[PDB]
Design an enzyme around this catalytic site. Sequence first.
Site, PDB file in Angstrom:
ATOM      1  N   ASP A 163       0.828  -1.196   0.000  1.00 32.98           N
ATOM      2  CA  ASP A 163       0.000   0.000   0.000  1.00 32.98           C
ATOM      3  C   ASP A 163       0.862   1.246   0.000  1.00 32.98           C
ATOM      4  OD1 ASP A 163      -2.763   1.132   0.262  1.00 32.98           O
ATOM      5  OD2 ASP A 163      -1.748   2.148   1.923  1.00 32.98           O
ATOM      6  N   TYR A 172       3.600   9.820   0.843  1.00 33.76           N
ATOM      7  CA  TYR A 172       4.497   9.197   1.824  1.00 33.76           C
ATOM      8  C   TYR A 172       5.963   9.507   1.545  1.00 33.76           C
ATOM      9  CZ  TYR A 172       0.240   6.481   2.824  1.00 33.76           C
ATOM     10  OH  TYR A 172      -1.056   6.118   3.068  1.00 33.76           O
ATOM     11  N   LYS A 227      -1.901   6.233  -4.434  1.00 32.86           N
ATOM     12  CA  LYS A 227      -2.968   7.174  -4.141  1.00 32.86           C
ATOM     13  C   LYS A 227      -2.656   8.527  -4.712  1.00 32.86           C
ATOM     14  CE  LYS A 227      -3.521   4.767   0.294  1.00 32.86           C
ATOM     15  NZ  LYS A 227      -2.089   4.551   0.664  1.00 32.86           N
ATOM     16  N   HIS A 258      -7.043   9.816  -2.589  1.00 37.77           N
ATOM     17  CA  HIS A 258      -6.599   9.649  -1.201  1.00 37.77           C
ATOM     18  C   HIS A 258      -7.602  10.258  -0.210  1.00 37.77           C
ATOM     19  CE1 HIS A 258      -2.561   9.252   1.163  1.00 37.77           C
ATOM     20  NE2 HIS A 258      -3.576   9.028   1.985  1.00 37.77           N
ATOM     21  N   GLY A 279      -4.302   0.531  14.953  1.00 34.50           N
ATOM     22  CA  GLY A 279      -4.537   1.782  15.686  1.00 34.50           C
ATOM     23  C   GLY A 279      -3.715   2.991  15.286  1.00 34.50           C
ATOM     24  N   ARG A 331       8.009  -8.196  13.610  1.00 31.26           N
ATOM     25  CA  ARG A 331       6.600  -7.832  13.561  1.00 31.26           C
ATOM     26  C   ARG A 331       5.991  -8.024  12.175  1.00 31.26           C
ATOM     27  NH1 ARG A 331       6.534  -2.283  17.198  1.00 31.26           N
ATOM     28  NH2 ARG A 331       6.418  -3.334  19.239  1.00 31.26           N
TER      29      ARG A 331
HETATM   30  N1  LIG Z   1      -5.688   6.053   3.024  1.00 29.89           N
HETATM   31  C1  LIG Z   1      -5.261   6.696   4.095  1.00 29.89           C
HETATM   32  O1  LIG Z   1      -5.599   7.992   4.296  1.00 29.89           O
HETATM   33  C2  LIG Z   1      -4.396   6.046   5.081  1.00 29.89           C
HETATM   34  C3  LIG Z   1      -4.300   6.572   6.379  1.00 29.89           C
HETATM   35  C4  LIG Z   1      -3.531   5.898   7.302  1.00 29.89           C
HETATM   36  C5  LIG Z   1      -2.859   4.742   6.926  1.00 29.89           C
HETATM   37  N2  LIG Z   1      -2.951   4.265   5.639  1.00 29.89           N
HETATM   38  C6  LIG Z   1      -2.219   3.028   5.237  1.00 29.89           C
HETATM   39  O2  LIG Z   1      -2.390   2.074   6.248  1.00 29.89           O
HETATM   40  C7  LIG Z   1      -1.135   1.620   6.707  1.00 29.89           C
HETATM   41  C8  LIG Z   1      -1.184   1.146   8.141  1.00 29.89           C
HETATM   42  O3  LIG Z   1      -1.616   2.182   9.018  1.00 29.89           O
HETATM   43  P1  LIG Z   1      -0.561   2.928   9.970  1.00 29.89           P
HETATM   44  O4  LIG Z   1       0.743   3.147   9.299  1.00 29.89           O
HETATM   45  O5  LIG Z   1      -1.293   4.137  10.499  1.00 29.89           O
HETATM   46  O6  LIG Z   1      -0.295   2.002  11.203  1.00 29.89           O
HETATM   47  P2  LIG Z   1      -0.777   0.561  11.766  1.00 29.89           P
HETATM   48  O7  LIG Z   1      -0.606  -0.504  10.718  1.00 29.89           O
HETATM   49  O8  LIG Z   1      -2.137   0.678  12.339  1.00 29.89           O
HETATM   50  O9  LIG Z   1       0.180   0.398  13.019  1.00 29.89           O
HETATM   51  C9  LIG Z   1       1.545   0.669  12.893  1.00 29.89           C
HETATM   52  C10 LIG Z   1       2.097   0.828  14.292  1.00 29.89           C
HETATM   53  O10 LIG Z   1       2.028  -0.370  15.066  1.00 29.89           O
HETATM   54  C11 LIG Z   1       3.333  -0.897  15.271  1.00 29.89           C
HETATM   55  N3  LIG Z   1       3.260  -2.354  15.083  1.00 29.89           N
HETATM   56  C12 LIG Z   1       3.201  -3.053  13.881  1.00 29.89           C
HETATM   57  N4  LIG Z   1       3.092  -4.360  14.137  1.00 29.89           N
HETATM   58  C13 LIG Z   1       3.074  -4.540  15.472  1.00 29.89           C
HETATM   59  C14 LIG Z   1       3.003  -5.695  16.229  1.00 29.89           C
HETATM   60  N5  LIG Z   1       2.889  -6.927  15.693  1.00 29.89           N
HETATM   61  N6  LIG Z   1       3.011  -5.562  17.600  1.00 29.89           N
HETATM   62  C15 LIG Z   1       3.112  -4.299  18.166  1.00 29.89           C
HETATM   63  N7  LIG Z   1       3.200  -3.154  17.418  1.00 29.89           N
HETATM   64  C16 LIG Z   1       3.185  -3.286  16.068  1.00 29.89           C
HETATM   65  C17 LIG Z   1       4.220  -0.118  14.301  1.00 29.89           C
HETATM   66  O11 LIG Z   1       5.461   0.166  14.852  1.00 29.89           O
HETATM   67  P3  LIG Z   1       6.839  -0.321  14.228  1.00 29.89           P
HETATM   68  O12 LIG Z   1       6.911   0.109  12.795  1.00 29.89           O
HETATM   69  O13 LIG Z   1       7.849   0.479  15.066  1.00 29.89           O
HETATM   70  O14 LIG Z   1       6.867  -1.782  14.457  1.00 29.89           O
HETATM   71  C18 LIG Z   1       3.541   1.220  14.119  1.00 29.89           C
HETATM   72  O15 LIG Z   1       3.888   2.134  15.135  1.00 29.89           O
HETATM   73  C19 LIG Z   1      -0.250   2.831   6.434  1.00 29.89           C
HETATM   74  O16 LIG Z   1       1.136   2.565   6.508  1.00 29.89           O
HETATM   75  C20 LIG Z   1      -0.712   3.239   5.073  1.00 29.89           C
HETATM   76  O17 LIG Z   1      -0.188   2.345   4.102  1.00 29.89           O
HETATM   77  C21 LIG Z   1      -3.707   4.888   4.718  1.00 29.89           C
END
Ligand SMILES: NC(=O)c1ccc[n+]([C@@H]2O[C@H](COP(=O)([O-])OP(=O)(O)OC[C@H]3O[C@@H](n4cnc5c(N)ncnc54)[C@H](OP(=O)(O)O)[C@@H]3O)[C@@H](O)[C@H]2O)c1
Length: 307
Positions: free
Chosen positions: A39, A44, A73, A106, A202, A254
Amino acid sequence: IRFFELNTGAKLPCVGLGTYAMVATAIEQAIKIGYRHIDCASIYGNEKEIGGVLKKLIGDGFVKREELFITSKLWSNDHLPEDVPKALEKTLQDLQIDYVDLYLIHWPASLKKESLMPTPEMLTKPDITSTWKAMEALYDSGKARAIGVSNFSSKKLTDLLNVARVTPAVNQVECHPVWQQQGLHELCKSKGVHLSGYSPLGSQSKGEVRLKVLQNPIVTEVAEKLGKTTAQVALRWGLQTGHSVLPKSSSGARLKENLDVFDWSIPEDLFTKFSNIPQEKFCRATEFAHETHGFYKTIEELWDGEI
Ligand SMILES: NC(=O)c1ccc[n+]([C@@H]2O[C@H](COP(=O)([O-])OP(=O)(O)OC[C@H]3O[C@@H](n4cnc5c(N)ncnc54)[C@H](OP(=O)(O)O)[C@@H]3O)[C@@H](O)[C@H]2O)c1
Protein backbone atom coordinates in the site's frame (compact mmCIF):
# COMPACT_ATOMS: atom_id res chain seq x y z
CA ILE A 1 -8.90 -17.95 1.19
CA ARG A 2 -6.02 -15.44 1.15
CA PHE A 3 -7.61 -12.86 -1.17
CA PHE A 4 -10.67 -10.69 -1.69
CA GLU A 5 -12.10 -10.59 -5.19
CA LEU A 6 -12.64 -7.07 -6.56
CA ASN A 7 -15.50 -6.10 -8.87
CA THR A 8 -12.97 -6.12 -11.74
CA GLY A 9 -12.22 -9.82 -11.03
CA ALA A 10 -8.77 -9.02 -9.64
CA LYS A 11 -7.54 -10.74 -6.50
CA LEU A 12 -6.53 -8.40 -3.67
CA PRO A 13 -4.30 -10.17 -1.13
CA CYS A 14 -5.94 -10.02 2.33
CA VAL A 15 -2.92 -8.55 4.10
CA GLY A 16 -1.18 -5.53 2.58
CA LEU A 17 2.02 -3.82 3.73
CA GLY A 18 1.47 -0.34 5.10
CA THR A 19 4.26 1.88 3.78
CA TYR A 20 3.75 5.18 5.64
CA ALA A 21 7.09 6.02 7.37
CA MET A 22 8.73 2.88 5.94
CA VAL A 23 12.22 2.84 4.47
CA ALA A 24 13.52 0.72 1.58
CA THR A 25 15.24 -1.95 3.70
CA ALA A 26 12.01 -2.71 5.59
CA ILE A 27 9.96 -2.87 2.36
CA GLU A 28 12.45 -5.36 0.88
CA GLN A 29 12.42 -7.41 4.09
CA ALA A 30 8.60 -7.45 3.99
CA ILE A 31 8.48 -8.85 0.47
CA LYS A 32 11.08 -11.52 1.40
CA ILE A 33 8.93 -12.44 4.43
CA GLY A 34 5.88 -12.87 2.17
CA TYR A 35 4.06 -9.57 1.57
CA ARG A 36 2.62 -9.29 -1.92
CA HIS A 37 0.13 -6.41 -1.52
CA ILE A 38 1.95 -3.10 -0.99
CA ASP A 39 0.00 0.00 0.00
CA CYS A 40 1.80 3.09 -1.31
CA ALA A 41 1.09 6.80 -1.75
CA SER A 42 2.96 9.67 -3.39
CA ILE A 43 2.49 11.75 -0.23
CA TYR A 44 4.50 9.20 1.82
CA GLY A 45 7.59 10.45 -0.01
CA ASN A 46 9.09 6.97 -0.43
CA GLU A 47 7.75 5.73 -3.76
CA LYS A 48 11.17 6.19 -5.46
CA GLU A 49 12.80 4.07 -2.74
CA ILE A 50 10.08 1.45 -3.13
CA GLY A 51 10.64 1.39 -6.89
CA GLY A 52 14.33 0.56 -6.33
CA VAL A 53 13.28 -2.39 -4.19
CA LEU A 54 10.68 -3.65 -6.70
CA LYS A 55 13.16 -3.31 -9.59
CA LYS A 56 15.73 -5.43 -7.72
CA LEU A 57 13.31 -8.15 -6.57
CA ILE A 58 11.65 -8.46 -9.98
CA GLY A 59 15.06 -8.31 -11.73
CA ASP A 60 16.45 -11.09 -9.51
CA GLY A 61 13.40 -13.28 -10.19
CA PHE A 62 12.28 -13.28 -6.54
CA VAL A 63 8.78 -12.28 -7.62
CA LYS A 64 7.17 -11.60 -10.96
CA ARG A 65 5.24 -8.36 -11.37
CA GLU A 66 1.96 -10.33 -11.54
CA GLU A 67 2.62 -11.73 -8.03
CA LEU A 68 2.48 -8.22 -6.55
CA PHE A 69 -0.55 -6.03 -5.87
CA ILE A 70 0.64 -2.44 -5.84
CA THR A 71 -1.65 0.35 -4.68
CA SER A 72 -0.94 4.07 -4.89
CA LYS A 73 -2.97 7.17 -4.14
CA LEU A 74 -3.69 10.51 -5.73
CA TRP A 75 -2.79 13.33 -3.38
CA SER A 76 -5.20 16.22 -2.80
CA ASN A 77 -3.22 18.89 -4.65
CA ASP A 78 -3.52 16.75 -7.84
CA HIS A 79 -7.37 16.50 -7.98
CA LEU A 80 -7.84 18.65 -11.09
CA PRO A 81 -8.37 16.57 -14.27
CA GLU A 82 -5.18 17.80 -15.96
CA ASP A 83 -3.14 16.86 -12.91
CA VAL A 84 -4.55 13.38 -12.23
CA PRO A 85 -2.71 11.60 -15.05
CA LYS A 86 0.51 13.53 -14.35
CA ALA A 87 0.37 12.37 -10.73
CA LEU A 88 0.01 8.72 -11.71
CA GLU A 89 2.82 9.04 -14.30
CA LYS A 90 5.17 10.34 -11.58
CA THR A 91 4.13 7.47 -9.29
CA LEU A 92 4.77 4.91 -12.04
CA GLN A 93 8.19 6.44 -12.80
CA ASP A 94 9.12 6.37 -9.09
CA LEU A 95 7.82 2.81 -8.57
CA GLN A 96 9.53 1.64 -11.80
CA ILE A 97 6.38 -0.17 -12.97
CA ASP A 98 4.08 0.18 -15.99
CA TYR A 99 0.79 0.08 -14.05
CA VAL A 100 -0.54 0.08 -10.50
CA ASP A 101 -3.03 -2.63 -9.46
CA LEU A 102 -5.10 -0.04 -7.60
CA TYR A 103 -5.15 3.77 -7.68
CA LEU A 104 -7.19 5.61 -5.06
CA ILE A 105 -8.37 9.17 -4.54
CA HIS A 106 -6.60 9.65 -1.20
CA TRP A 107 -9.13 12.15 0.28
CA PRO A 108 -12.45 13.68 -0.81
CA ALA A 109 -10.97 17.10 0.00
CA SER A 110 -8.88 19.02 -2.52
CA LEU A 111 -5.94 21.42 -2.22
CA LYS A 112 -4.45 24.09 -4.47
CA LYS A 113 -1.97 22.65 -6.98
CA GLU A 114 0.94 24.60 -5.45
CA SER A 115 0.44 23.07 -2.03
CA LEU A 116 1.48 19.75 -0.57
CA MET A 117 0.61 19.68 3.15
CA PRO A 118 -2.99 20.67 3.92
CA THR A 119 -3.39 24.13 5.45
CA PRO A 120 -6.57 26.17 5.70
CA GLU A 121 -5.68 28.73 3.02
CA MET A 122 -4.80 25.90 0.56
CA LEU A 123 -8.20 24.14 0.81
CA THR A 124 -10.32 24.27 -2.36
CA LYS A 125 -13.80 23.26 -3.49
CA PRO A 126 -13.53 19.67 -4.68
CA ASP A 127 -15.09 18.31 -7.85
CA ILE A 128 -14.98 14.58 -7.29
CA THR A 129 -17.03 13.87 -10.46
CA SER A 130 -14.33 15.46 -12.62
CA THR A 131 -11.53 13.82 -10.64
CA TRP A 132 -13.23 10.44 -10.97
CA LYS A 133 -13.66 10.90 -14.74
CA ALA A 134 -9.90 11.38 -14.93
CA MET A 135 -9.41 8.24 -12.80
CA GLU A 136 -11.69 6.41 -15.24
CA ALA A 137 -9.37 7.44 -18.10
CA LEU A 138 -6.43 5.85 -16.22
CA TYR A 139 -8.47 2.64 -15.85
CA ASP A 140 -9.42 2.73 -19.55
CA SER A 141 -5.71 2.98 -20.57
CA GLY A 142 -4.59 0.28 -18.12
CA LYS A 143 -2.39 2.61 -16.05
CA ALA A 144 -4.46 1.63 -13.00
CA ARG A 145 -6.00 -1.83 -13.24
CA ALA A 146 -8.55 -0.90 -10.59
CA ILE A 147 -9.58 2.53 -9.34
CA GLY A 148 -11.11 3.44 -6.00
CA VAL A 149 -11.36 5.95 -3.22
CA SER A 150 -10.14 6.47 0.33
CA ASN A 151 -11.69 8.27 3.31
CA PHE A 152 -15.12 8.45 1.68
CA SER A 153 -18.10 8.40 4.04
CA SER A 154 -21.18 6.30 3.29
CA LYS A 155 -22.79 9.42 1.83
CA LYS A 156 -19.81 10.45 -0.33
CA LEU A 157 -19.39 6.88 -1.60
CA THR A 158 -23.11 6.74 -2.42
CA ASP A 159 -22.87 10.08 -4.23
CA LEU A 160 -19.93 8.85 -6.31
CA LEU A 161 -21.68 5.57 -7.09
CA ASN A 162 -24.63 7.58 -8.43
CA VAL A 163 -22.45 9.35 -11.08
CA ALA A 164 -19.67 6.81 -11.77
CA ARG A 165 -19.38 4.82 -14.98
CA VAL A 166 -16.65 2.61 -13.52
CA THR A 167 -17.79 1.46 -10.05
CA PRO A 168 -15.10 2.17 -7.43
CA ALA A 169 -13.34 -1.13 -6.63
CA VAL A 170 -12.18 -0.19 -3.13
CA ASN A 171 -12.90 2.33 -0.38
CA GLN A 172 -9.88 2.37 1.93
CA VAL A 173 -10.84 3.69 5.37
CA GLU A 174 -9.63 3.61 8.95
CA CYS A 175 -10.81 0.32 10.44
CA HIS A 176 -9.81 -1.55 13.59
CA PRO A 177 -11.62 -2.79 16.74
CA VAL A 178 -12.01 0.82 17.99
CA TRP A 179 -13.51 2.03 14.67
CA GLN A 180 -15.42 -0.90 13.21
CA GLN A 181 -17.27 0.77 10.28
CA GLN A 182 -20.28 -1.56 10.51
CA GLY A 183 -22.60 0.59 8.38
CA LEU A 184 -20.03 1.26 5.71
CA HIS A 185 -19.23 -2.48 5.48
CA GLU A 186 -22.94 -3.13 4.78
CA LEU A 187 -23.07 -0.47 2.07
CA CYS A 188 -19.85 -1.56 0.43
CA LYS A 189 -20.90 -5.22 0.40
CA SER A 190 -24.30 -4.38 -1.13
CA LYS A 191 -22.60 -2.42 -3.97
CA GLY A 192 -19.71 -4.82 -4.62
CA VAL A 193 -17.11 -2.33 -3.32
CA HIS A 194 -14.31 -3.81 -1.23
CA LEU A 195 -13.65 -2.07 2.11
CA SER A 196 -9.92 -2.00 2.94
CA GLY A 197 -8.88 -1.22 6.53
CA TYR A 198 -6.08 1.23 7.08
CA SER A 199 -4.44 1.72 10.46
CA PRO A 200 -5.58 -1.77 11.48
CA LEU A 201 -3.37 -1.69 14.61
CA GLY A 202 -4.54 1.78 15.69
CA SER A 203 -2.23 3.98 13.58
CA GLN A 204 1.13 5.70 14.00
CA SER A 205 -0.37 8.79 15.68
CA LYS A 206 1.86 10.28 18.40
CA GLY A 207 1.09 9.63 22.05
CA GLU A 208 0.76 5.85 21.66
CA VAL A 209 -2.83 6.15 20.35
CA ARG A 210 -2.49 2.61 18.97
CA LEU A 211 -2.51 1.22 22.52
CA LYS A 212 -6.30 1.73 22.41
CA VAL A 213 -6.27 -1.20 19.96
CA LEU A 214 -3.17 -3.19 20.92
CA GLN A 215 -3.91 -3.03 24.64
CA ASN A 216 -7.72 -2.86 24.56
CA PRO A 217 -9.01 -5.13 27.36
CA ILE A 218 -11.18 -7.26 25.05
CA VAL A 219 -8.43 -7.59 22.43
CA THR A 220 -6.02 -8.54 25.24
CA GLU A 221 -8.44 -11.15 26.66
CA VAL A 222 -8.96 -12.76 23.25
CA ALA A 223 -5.20 -12.77 22.59
CA GLU A 224 -4.55 -14.53 25.91
CA LYS A 225 -7.28 -17.12 25.31
CA LEU A 226 -6.08 -17.95 21.77
CA GLY A 227 -2.32 -17.80 22.47
CA LYS A 228 -1.75 -14.99 19.96
CA THR A 229 -0.48 -11.43 20.17
CA THR A 230 -2.89 -8.52 20.31
CA ALA A 231 -1.67 -7.37 16.88
CA GLN A 232 -2.51 -10.81 15.50
CA VAL A 233 -5.97 -10.68 17.05
CA ALA A 234 -6.63 -7.14 15.75
CA LEU A 235 -5.65 -8.22 12.23
CA ARG A 236 -7.55 -11.49 12.30
CA TRP A 237 -10.57 -9.59 13.62
CA GLY A 238 -10.40 -7.34 10.55
CA LEU A 239 -10.17 -10.23 8.10
CA GLN A 240 -13.12 -11.96 9.75
CA THR A 241 -15.09 -8.71 9.51
CA GLY A 242 -14.55 -8.91 5.73
CA HIS A 243 -11.98 -6.21 4.91
CA SER A 244 -8.35 -6.36 3.95
CA VAL A 245 -5.85 -5.05 6.53
CA LEU A 246 -2.78 -2.87 5.87
CA PRO A 247 -0.43 -3.26 8.84
CA LYS A 248 2.78 -1.28 8.88
CA SER A 249 5.99 -2.31 10.69
CA SER A 250 9.65 -1.40 10.40
CA SER A 251 10.55 -4.60 12.31
CA GLY A 252 11.20 -7.89 10.55
CA ALA A 253 9.87 -9.78 13.57
CA ARG A 254 6.60 -7.83 13.56
CA LEU A 255 6.29 -8.07 9.76
CA LYS A 256 6.41 -11.87 10.15
CA GLU A 257 4.00 -11.82 13.10
CA ASN A 258 1.48 -9.70 11.23
CA LEU A 259 1.19 -12.30 8.42
CA ASP A 260 0.28 -15.13 10.85
CA VAL A 261 -3.42 -14.51 10.59
CA PHE A 262 -4.57 -17.32 8.26
CA ASP A 263 -4.19 -20.74 9.93
CA TRP A 264 -6.34 -19.96 12.99
CA SER A 265 -9.43 -17.93 13.75
CA ILE A 266 -11.31 -16.11 16.47
CA PRO A 267 -14.26 -18.28 17.58
CA GLU A 268 -17.70 -16.64 17.50
CA ASP A 269 -18.11 -16.52 21.31
CA LEU A 270 -14.99 -14.33 21.47
CA PHE A 271 -15.65 -12.52 18.16
CA THR A 272 -18.96 -11.20 19.47
CA LYS A 273 -17.20 -9.59 22.49
CA PHE A 274 -15.69 -6.94 20.18
CA SER A 275 -19.15 -5.31 19.98
CA ASN A 276 -18.60 -3.73 23.42
CA ILE A 277 -15.37 -1.86 22.59
CA PRO A 278 -15.72 1.96 22.87
CA GLN A 279 -15.54 3.56 19.41
CA GLU A 280 -13.23 6.44 18.43
CA LYS A 281 -11.65 7.55 15.14
CA PHE A 282 -7.95 8.31 15.24
CA CYS A 283 -7.32 9.83 11.81
CA ARG A 284 -9.61 12.82 12.13
CA ALA A 285 -8.51 14.97 9.15
CA THR A 286 -8.80 18.26 10.97
CA GLU A 287 -6.37 19.57 8.34
CA PHE A 288 -8.96 19.17 5.56
CA ALA A 289 -11.69 21.27 7.26
CA HIS A 290 -11.86 24.87 8.40
CA GLU A 291 -14.75 27.08 9.55
CA THR A 292 -13.58 30.09 7.53
CA HIS A 293 -11.25 28.87 4.80
CA GLY A 294 -12.41 25.32 4.16
CA PHE A 295 -14.87 23.77 1.78
CA TYR A 296 -15.73 21.34 4.55
CA LYS A 297 -16.29 23.67 7.50
CA THR A 298 -15.89 20.97 10.17
CA ILE A 299 -14.62 17.41 10.30
CA GLU A 300 -18.22 16.33 10.91
CA GLU A 301 -18.99 17.70 7.42
CA LEU A 302 -15.91 16.00 5.91
CA TRP A 303 -17.02 12.63 7.31
CA ASP A 304 -20.80 13.25 6.92
CA GLY A 305 -21.08 12.54 10.64
CA GLU A 306 -19.06 9.30 10.51
CA ILE A 307 -16.77 10.34 13.35
N1 LIG B 1 -5.69 6.05 3.02
C1 LIG B 1 -5.26 6.70 4.10
O1 LIG B 1 -5.60 7.99 4.30
C2 LIG B 1 -4.40 6.05 5.08
C3 LIG B 1 -4.30 6.57 6.38
C4 LIG B 1 -3.53 5.90 7.30
C5 LIG B 1 -2.86 4.74 6.93
N2 LIG B 1 -2.95 4.26 5.64
C6 LIG B 1 -2.22 3.03 5.24
O2 LIG B 1 -2.39 2.07 6.25
C7 LIG B 1 -1.13 1.62 6.71
C8 LIG B 1 -1.18 1.15 8.14
O3 LIG B 1 -1.62 2.18 9.02
P1 LIG B 1 -0.56 2.93 9.97
O4 LIG B 1 0.74 3.15 9.30
O5 LIG B 1 -1.29 4.14 10.50
O6 LIG B 1 -0.29 2.00 11.20
P2 LIG B 1 -0.78 0.56 11.77
O7 LIG B 1 -0.61 -0.50 10.72
O8 LIG B 1 -2.14 0.68 12.34
O9 LIG B 1 0.18 0.40 13.02
C9 LIG B 1 1.55 0.67 12.89
C10 LIG B 1 2.10 0.83 14.29
O10 LIG B 1 2.03 -0.37 15.07
C11 LIG B 1 3.33 -0.90 15.27
N3 LIG B 1 3.26 -2.35 15.08
C12 LIG B 1 3.20 -3.05 13.88
N4 LIG B 1 3.09 -4.36 14.14
C13 LIG B 1 3.07 -4.54 15.47
C14 LIG B 1 3.00 -5.70 16.23
N5 LIG B 1 2.89 -6.93 15.69
N6 LIG B 1 3.01 -5.56 17.60
C15 LIG B 1 3.11 -4.30 18.17
N7 LIG B 1 3.20 -3.15 17.42
C16 LIG B 1 3.19 -3.29 16.07
C17 LIG B 1 4.22 -0.12 14.30
O11 LIG B 1 5.46 0.17 14.85
P3 LIG B 1 6.84 -0.32 14.23
O12 LIG B 1 6.91 0.11 12.80
O13 LIG B 1 7.85 0.48 15.07
O14 LIG B 1 6.87 -1.78 14.46
C18 LIG B 1 3.54 1.22 14.12
O15 LIG B 1 3.89 2.13 15.14
C19 LIG B 1 -0.25 2.83 6.43
O16 LIG B 1 1.14 2.57 6.51
C20 LIG B 1 -0.71 3.24 5.07
O17 LIG B 1 -0.19 2.35 4.10
C21 LIG B 1 -3.71 4.89 4.72
